[PDB]
């Protein structure tokens, strides 16, 4: 003697987080810079540390 | 023929006919004399003539519960 | 020229059956007239929310059902490809190979070609969000959903029921039960399978002979096992620092063994794991990068070289071959497999950066102050790793 | 049901006290849709046709010629023709594509023909079709031919291996007609499976598919024409349906590789024979891995292959080199 009301069936898929990889080990890798620009800084002048 | 049978029949729902395809309209049905017979029918397992014909009787169940012979929740509670 | 003669008859069982001279039809022929069939991709994005949430990671149990909604999102993008609609069309099929397609496939026993359909619609997503499916597989394993739990667990232990009984006489008959376990579930039967890698040798010569017979879906997991741990929280120097670890010089024979057996497994994520941590100084993608040269390249040193063969090595001729080969210097066996190897710096443009990175760190070790005998072998290590690259890049980059 | 023996000159090489090698080899077989004819060959041996019209085995022997295909080359496979009944296509191994005749009131074998489309470099299958109105000659070095057999032997068209695939040098290993005849199942060595339409005379491929990731070794076809079968060098041997063109079952006994596969005219048992020199059985309608027999065999080489009429069981595997067939094998015990 009740009255049942249509179920509502979830429509909705998940979000992502921020962390672009797996883990927080993976990621923290991925995100230190790569070129060769950075490397020119420290061979600067062999001579003028010399 | 089955159901052409009992379709004219003085025991088939004529205004409480309604069926087992919507959400709300699976306790509002018809027949609770039928609801009575196949709820008793289906309860009794413990014998054996009665296991060698269980698959057989439950098939005919089965396509009266889609015709809108008898209900879902008065054989659905009904069984053991 | 006759043909076959076959019976209808009528049954009580749903799956069709043929007998010797029958078939077995249903006999509700009109089972099928409450459900109609629908259109191409807006209803079976709808009709799965309803069905495919009341069969969760079930659907392992219907192996034929799971290639055919692969098959469409394969032949969707395809025929979808043009220049326009692949942007929202590539990430509506990331949310549903997520939601119930992925862990519908860990419910699987021993299936290599339906694990190989799903990598299939696989291959036309980015990288980066193929790892954060395969690793929302690993913590939503145990704290979540039941009939997958016990299936993760049943895989660990036939895992390691296979790495007891690994035998160099049975490899015949064992390397194809293996592979056949890592082409269904190798979320499962690789973190056992890589742990009794760095931990004892002898059966490292032993995985890599199974590797010929993997499919491409094992191929992207396992080198997000080997990145997994590689990065994982240890300490990578030991008590003292007169030695790195036993792990970081038994995980290096098998990343380079990788690269000279199969041909098949893309690394291209593992060197780049190489170029991006010698920017900070780090021990394992030096030795990583060390035992790559001398296996995959035949490169060897000359600091114990003869006089007489000192003098042969540099006369320009075939007693330059002959010198090489008393030495045991193979650079004309293994020359393809050599030039694949740069094929991936090349790809990157990292070949100026190695050489710039080798020698900075090598003139950064000059001021650290760790010990006294250390640093004089240190010192001596990096210098025949950076003369043991640019050799490589002259035969390869020939011309 | 009872063993009984194979009365060829097999038999007699070691019943003798001969000591190093008795026959020697075994190349290929094949059946005409007849049921009552046999393609026996061997490698340096002879080539012996059948013809047993009535007993087991025990009636008559037929004939055995070594210098049949000439006496310098061998055959790779012998093809015969559905529509004429004394017809067997052999290709040998250089350059020769004859067509030879029997006759049973002589002991003897004539040739009707040798043609040949030049620069044949080596034609290793041949087979024709179901019907028996074409001809697919096809090298596993360079390309693939196609020719008819209703008015005469003349090519019409040909298609080069490497518009199919792309990836390496690839060996084509076996490929298989398919049973309305109109088109072209085909397996390569890195598990590709690609399908060729061959209507009349036109050569044009459809899909591929990765099968698996070994030489897929043998492809066979099932009576009925609901699905086919193929196998491996791995353990696995898929059944794919053919209306909807995925899996159904997955025979998973990866005890060796997979040489051998047949099916049975009705299309019930699926023999399997391994490299580990055990031979197995199975189900296609029933479950996955529902064994009904499986049988050691001794240190040799078998061969395993099921006639087109009626099921009996032709296995080899003797000492050497002898076959045996099996009367009445409905129940197999």
Known sequence: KEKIPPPAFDETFKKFTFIKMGNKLINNVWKIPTGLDKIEQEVKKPEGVY | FFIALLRKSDSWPSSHVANNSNYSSLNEGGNMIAANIISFNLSQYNEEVDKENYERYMDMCCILLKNGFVNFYSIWDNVK | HKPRLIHKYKTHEPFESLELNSSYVFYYSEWNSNLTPFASVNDLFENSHIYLSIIGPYLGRIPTLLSKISRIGV?????????????????????????????????????????????????????????????????????????????????????????????????????????????????????????????????????????????????????????????????????????????????????????????????????????????????????????????????????????????????????????????????DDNSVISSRLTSFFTDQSAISEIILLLYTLNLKANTQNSHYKILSTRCDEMNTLLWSFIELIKHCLKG | ??????????????????????????????????????????????????????????????????????????????????????????????????????????????????????????????????????????????????????????????????????EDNDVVYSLAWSNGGSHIFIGFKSGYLAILKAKHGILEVCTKIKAHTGPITEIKMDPWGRNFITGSIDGNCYVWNMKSLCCELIINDLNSAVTTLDVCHLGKILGICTEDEMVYFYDLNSGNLLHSKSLANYKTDPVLKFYPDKSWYIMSGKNDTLSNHFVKNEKNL
Request: charged fraction near 20%; include cysteine.
């Open chain 4, 1 to 166: 049901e009872d063993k009984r023996f194979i009365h060829v000159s097999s038999r007699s090489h070691s019943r003798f006290t001969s000591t190093p090698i008795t026959p020697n080899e075994i190349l290929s077989l094949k059946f005409h849709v007849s049921g009552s004819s046999m393609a026996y060959s061997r490698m340096d041996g002879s080539l012996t046709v059948w013809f047993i019209k009535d007993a087991s085995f025990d009636k008559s022997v037929e004939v055995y010629i070594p210098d049949c295909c000439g006496s310098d080359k061998l055959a790779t496979d012998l093809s015969w023709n559905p529509t004429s009944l004394n017809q067997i296509a052999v290709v040998s191994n250089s350059s020769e594509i004859s067509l030879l005749l029997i006759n049973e009131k002589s002991l003897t074998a004539s040739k009707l023909r040798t043609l040949s489309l030049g620069s044949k470099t080596k034609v290793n299958t041949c087979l024709y079709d179901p019907l028996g109105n074409w001809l697919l000659a096809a090298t596993k070095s360079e390309k693939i031919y196609l020719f008819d057999v209703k008015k005469d032997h003349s090519s019409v068209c040909s298609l080069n291996i490497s518009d199919i695939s792309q």
């Open chain 3, 75 to 331: 032949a969707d993008i395809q025929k979808n490809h043009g220049s326009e609609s692949l942007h929202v069309t590539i990430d509506k099929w990331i949310d549903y190979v997520r939601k119930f397609i992925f862990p519908a496939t860990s419910l699987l026993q021993n299936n290599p070609i339906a694990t190989s359909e799903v990598y299939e619609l696989m291959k036309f997503f980015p990288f980066e969000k193929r790892y954060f499916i395969y690793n929302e597989m690993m913590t939503k394993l145990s704290q979540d959903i039941l009939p997958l739990k016990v299936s993760f667990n049943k895989a660990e232990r036939e895992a390691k029921s296979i790495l007891k009984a690994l035998s160099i006489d049975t490899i015949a008959k064992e390397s194809r039960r293996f592979a056949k376990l890592i082409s269904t579930n190798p979320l499962a039967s690789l973190v056992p399978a890589v742990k009794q890698i760095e931990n004892y040798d002898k059966v490292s010569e032993l995985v890599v002979y199974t590797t010929k017979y993997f499919n491409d879906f094992a191929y992207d997991v396992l080198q997000f096992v080997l990145l997994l741990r590689l990065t994982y929280n240890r300490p990578a120097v030991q008590f003292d620092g007169v030695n790195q670890a036993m792990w970081v010089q038994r995980l290096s024979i098998f990343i380079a063994g990788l690269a000279k057996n199969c041909p098949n497994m893309d690394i291209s994520n593992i060197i780049t794991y190489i170029l991006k941590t010698l920017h900070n100084g780090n021990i394992i993608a030096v030795s990583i990068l060390k035992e790559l040269i001398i296996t995959v390249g035949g490169i060897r040193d000359l600091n114990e070289v003869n006089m007489k063969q000192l003098l042969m090595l540099n006369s320009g001729s075939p007693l330059k071959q002959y010198a090489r080969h008393l030495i045991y210097d193979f650079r």
